[PDB]
Amino acid sequence: NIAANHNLENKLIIITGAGGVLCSFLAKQLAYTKANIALLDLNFEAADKVAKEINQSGGKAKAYKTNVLELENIKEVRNQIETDFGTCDILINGAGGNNPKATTDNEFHQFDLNETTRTFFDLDKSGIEFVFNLNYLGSLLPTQVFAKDMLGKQGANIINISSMNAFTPLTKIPAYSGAKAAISNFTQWLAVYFSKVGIRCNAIAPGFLVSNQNLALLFDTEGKPTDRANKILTNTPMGRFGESEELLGALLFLIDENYSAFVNGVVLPVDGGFSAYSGV
Amino acid sequence: NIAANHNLENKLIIITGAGGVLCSFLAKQLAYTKANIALLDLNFEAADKVAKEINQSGGKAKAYKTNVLELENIKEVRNQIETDFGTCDILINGAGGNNPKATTDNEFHQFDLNETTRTFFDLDKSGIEFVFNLNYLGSLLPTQVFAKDMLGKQGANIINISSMNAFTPLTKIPAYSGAKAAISNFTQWLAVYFSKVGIRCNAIAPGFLVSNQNLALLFDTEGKPTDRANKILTNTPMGRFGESEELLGALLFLIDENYSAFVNGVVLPVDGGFSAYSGV
Ligand SMILES: NC(=O)c1ccc[n+]([C@@H]2O[C@H](COP(=O)([O-])OP(=O)(O)OC[C@H]3O[C@@H](n4cnc5c(N)ncnc54)[C@H](O)[C@@H]3O)[C@@H](O)[C@H]2O)c1
Ligand SMILES: NC(=O)c1ccc[n+]([C@@H]2O[C@H](COP(=O)([O-])OP(=O)(O)OC[C@H]3O[C@@H](n4cnc5c(N)ncnc54)[C@H](O)[C@@H]3O)[C@@H](O)[C@H]2O)c1
């Protein structure tokens, strides 16, 4: 495991959205750095599954039911973590994602759309708010709580998770795209804000990844690749979807001061060349 | 040494501009990956000094006098390297640099500058040509020679070296800024061109670094920064120059397929936050 190359013994990594697909994979690999891992998620059972796997594999982890949108809940969790492990060294803001209420059915408006089609005009204010809250405030509020504890600590840093959308928006998903542009911006803002007290901030922008959770979404109901999947492959030079494991190197690089002490305020694409391609 | 984390035993790393400040330092560290290192430079003595140090420490290196602008010379050197080590796995295009004839004395034009000041109007065509030749063709021609050999080799990849000045240009240095903008662009072009045959191409964009060779250029005022150095420091969030050591992590990240298999066409800033800040 390449994570074993990076000695983070006695450091505490706090990971939000830890029960999710990407973060649960990454959390399990980060255990091999010998760090203590706190797994924060609204879904305690999902995070606790990850904690059990880590502990069974010889690592050190614990799950904490947390709502990243509720500041005083995060603060309570921070106190429990202090009892169990200590205070934060590395914060990974993994909580995030999109939802159907802020997604259109159609790539483009048209003059001949079926009445059942959810268009731009059908997106609910609360759906848009939900996406921005989760993907921006859900990183900002944990950063307020845990960065306070990181102040002054050698090697402290923050990781946010951006998206291809932050570079150029994707069709159908305006709120998610806008919120990820905002978190890319916030990454740079934080890097500058904390630049005199030694907390770096960087982001990983994954490209198009596949997992067993989204595999079925890449096909229509008859098992043919969707037009969107075909467009993704067409506009990805390496001609494939990425895998979760392909984010691990970037994460280790950015969180390990021996590798990235002078790397700060970067949004690092891991995307098979997608953002380097014109389409032509 | 973190380079020892990355097993490149029996692979061949070809480094151009190897006798230079940054590349000589990085080549010495890459020897700890156990790769064979070929050190290419127009200054044989400078490259051979590095080869001797690497070999004395138990590494495997050889220097080769090369002009990266002369295709037939690069081809002859490629043949020599095949005899000594074999064929290229990883190419680092480190040859590059500016020329005083393509640089102004003044950051901005004014009326009634004295005759002695070298202004925009004094920039020499041959100096501008020199900078573009060295920084763009000086990467493209070795890539033509050595990528031919990398075809079919698992894990093969190309590294270019860009600059801050590629993102927005720096005062006084139009040609060097333009040529590095062009190599950033070429990095993306190569990534796409080789994307269906398994050769990644990425670039590192070092920010403002200090070395033994430029220390007395940055701190002239005995140990107070020069006016340019003060501009750099005030516009770098981390408030310091970078060191050669602080580029190694990024290099290892990008050249090791275990870390960066899906990272392609990226230009990675290593700059203390410079690119994330606008001075306000
Ligand atoms: N999956 C991808 O391919 C991909 C690509 C680019 C970016 N991202 C981003 O990566 C991050 C993780 O994505 P994912 O697909 O693995 O997510 P996921 O949907 O699989 O999991 C998200 C996790 O966040 C939890 N969560 C939701 N609301 C919460 C809240 N208020 N407080 C605490 N926890 C909450 C959920 O319970 C869940 O466990 C997100 O920021 C996502 O936007 C994902
Ligand atoms: N030094 C920095 O802080 C910095 C910052 C950003 C980018 N860069 C870029 O990093 C790379 C190395 O920079 P450096 O400062 O260490 O350079 P350097 O001037 O110290 O060394 C450059 C090397 O290239 C060799 N060279 C010149 N012309 C050649 C030719 N035609 N064929 C073969 N070799 C030739 C030189 O002999 C020299 O050894 C360059 O591309 C530079 O543009 C450097």
Torsion sign over Cα A82, A86, A92, A94? negative
Does A206 sit in the ligand 1 pocket, CB within 6 Å?
Answer: yes
Q: B270 and A263 in contact (C-beta within 8 Å)?
A: yes
State how far Cα A274 lies from the chain centre. 18
Does A269 sit in the ligand 1 pocket, CB within 6 Å?
Answer: no
Helix (H) or strand (E) holding A64: strand A60-65
Q: Tokens 């989204």 identify what position?
A: A214
Q: For residue A66, what are its two tokens?
A: 């947390």
Helix (H) or strand (E) holding A40: strand A36-41
Torsion sign over Cα A267, A268, A270, A275? positive
Experiment type: X-ray
Using the mean position of ligand 1's atoms as its centre, give its distance from the Cα of residue A46 in Å: 12
Q: Which of A24, A39, A41 to mutate to test the pocket of ligand 1 (most atoms within 8 A of CB)?
A: A41
By C-alpha distance, which of B150, B149, B136, B214 is closest to B181? Answer: B136
Local structure of A117: helix, strand or coil:
coil
Burial category of B276 from C-beta neighbours within 10 Å (exposed 0-12, middle 13-18, buried 19 and up): buried
By C-alpha distance, which of B266, B268, B267, B217 is closest to B241? Answer: B217
Report in angstroms the alpha-carbon separations of A268 from A95, B42, B158: 18, 34, 18
> Shortest CB distance from A273 goes to which of B5, B259, B264?
B264
Does A69 sit in the ligand 1 pocket, CB within 6 Å?
Answer: yes
- If one counts every other C-beta atom within 10 angstroms of the C-beta of residue A216, the result is 10
Angle between helices B174-193 and B125-132 (to 10 degrees): 30
Does B277 contact A192 at a Cβ distance shorter than 8 Å? yes
Report in angstroms the alpha-carbon separations of A87 from A12, A90, A93, A142, A255: 7, 9, 16, 13, 16
Q: For residue A246, what are its two tokens?
A: 């392909």
Does A262 contact B246 at a Cβ distance shorter than 8 Å? yes
Question: In chain A, what is the straight-line distance between the N-terminal and C-terminal CA atoms, in Å?
Answer: 38
Q: B251 and B218 in contact (C-beta within 8 Å)?
A: no
Q: What is the resolution of this structure in A?
A: 1.6
Q: Which of B23, B131, B139, B183 to mutate to test the pocket of ligand 2 (most atoms within 8 A of CB)?
A: B23
| Per-residue burial over B49-86, b = 16 or more CB atoms within 10 Å of its CB, e = otherwise | bbbeebeeeebbbbbbbbbbbeeebbeebbeebeeebe
User: What is the strand order of the sheet B90-93 is part of?
Assistant: B60-65, B36-41, B12-16, B90-93, B157-161, B200-206, B267-270
Closest C-alpha residue for ligand 1 atom 17: A20
By C-alpha distance, which of B10, B72, B65 is closest to B43? Answer: B65
Q: For residue A141, what are its two tokens?
A: 């509020």
Q: B246 and B268 in contact (C-beta within 8 Å)?
A: no
Ligand 1 atom closest to the Cα of residue A183 is 41
Q: For residue B172, what are its two tokens?
A: 């006084």
Does B262 contact A275 at a Cβ distance shorter than 8 Å? no
Q: Tell me if chain B has a CB within 8 Å of the CB of A260.
A: yes
Q: d(Cα B144, Cα A86) in Å, to the nearest integer?
A: 54
- If one counts every other C-beta atom within 10 angstroms of the C-beta of residue B148, the result is 12
Local structure of A45: helix, strand or coil:
helix
Classify the phi-psi angles of B155: left when phi > 0, otherwise alpha if psi is within -120 to 50, otherwise beta: left
Closest C-alpha residue for ligand 1 atom 18: A20
Using the mean position of ligand 1's atoms as its centre, give its distance from the Cα of residue B171 in Å: 43
Q: A30 and A51 in contact (C-beta within 8 Å)?
A: no
Q: d(Cα B241, Cα A129) in Å, to the nearest integer?
A: 42
Q: Which amino acid is at A86?
A: G
State how far Cα A251 lies from the chain centre. 11
The catalytic position among B176, B193, B259, B277 is B176
Give alpha helix (H) positions in chain A: 21-30, 44-56, 71-84, 125-132, 138-150, 174-193, 227-235, 248-255, 257-260
| Per-residue burial over B26-45, b = 16 or more CB atoms within 10 Å of its CB, e = otherwise | bbbbbbbbbbbbbbbbbebe
Closest C-alpha residue for ligand 1 atom 15: A21
Sort strands A36-41 and A60-65 into parallel, antiparallel or unpaired.
Answer: parallel
Report in angstroms the alpha-carbon separations of A139 from A86, A94, A96, A165: 21, 8, 8, 17
Closest C-alpha residue for ligand 2 atom 15: B21
By C-alpha distance, which of B47, B51, B89, B37 is closest to B68? Answer: B47
Q: Tokens 């594999």 identify what position?
A: A57
Local structure of A201: helix, strand or coil:
strand
By C-alpha distance, which of B136, B137, B155, B156 is closest to B146? Answer: B156
Using the mean position of ligand 2's atoms as its centre, give its distance from the Cα of residue B17 in Å: 5
Active site residue A136: no
Does A192 contact B237 at a Cβ distance shorter than 8 Å? yes
- If one counts every other C-beta atom within 10 angstroms of the C-beta of residue A74, the result is 22
Q: A241 and A220 in contact (C-beta within 8 Å)?
A: no
| Per-residue burial over B184-205, b = 16 or more CB atoms within 10 Å of its CB, e = otherwise | bebbbbbbbebbeebbbbbbbb
Q: d(Cα B187, Cα B195) in Å, to the nearest integer?
A: 12
By C-alpha distance, which of A96, A97, A187, A179 is closest to A138? Answer: A96
Helix (H) or strand (E) holding A60: strand A60-65
State how far Cα B85 lies from the chain centre. 23
Structural domains of chain A sorted by starting position, each given as residue range(s) with its CATH number in brackets: 1-280 (3.40.50.720)
Read out DSSP for chain B? -GGGGS--TT-EEEEETTTSHHHHHHHHHHGGGT-EEEEEES-HHHHHHHHHHHHHTT-EEEEEE--TT-HHHHHHHHHHHHHHT-S-SEEEE------GGG--S-SS--TT--TTS--GGG--HHHHHHHHIIIIIHHHHHHHHHHHHHTT-TT-EEEEE--GGGTSPPTT-HHHHHHHHHHHHHHHHHHHHTTTTT-EEEEEEE-SB--TTTHHHH--STTSPPHHHHHHHHTSTT-S-B-GGGGHHHHHHHH-HHHHTT--S-EEEESTTGGG----
- What's chain A's length in residues? 280
Q: Tokens 């295009």 identify what position?
A: B93
Q: For residue A8, what are its two tokens?
A: 């983070």
Q: Tell me if chain B has a CB within 8 Å of the CB of A48.
A: no
Q: d(Cα A231, Cα A226) in Å, to the nearest integer?
A: 9
Q: d(Cα B122, Cα B17) in Å, to the nearest integer?
A: 29
By C-alpha distance, which of B13, B53, B62 is closest to B33? Answer: B13
The bound ligand whose nearest atom lies closest to the alpha carbon of A208 is 1
Using the mean position of ligand 1's atoms as its centre, give its distance from the Cα of residue A239 in Å: 25
For residue A218, give how far its alpha carbon lies from the nearest alpha carbon of chain B (Å). Answer: 19
Q: For residue A132, what are its two tokens?
A: 């921005």
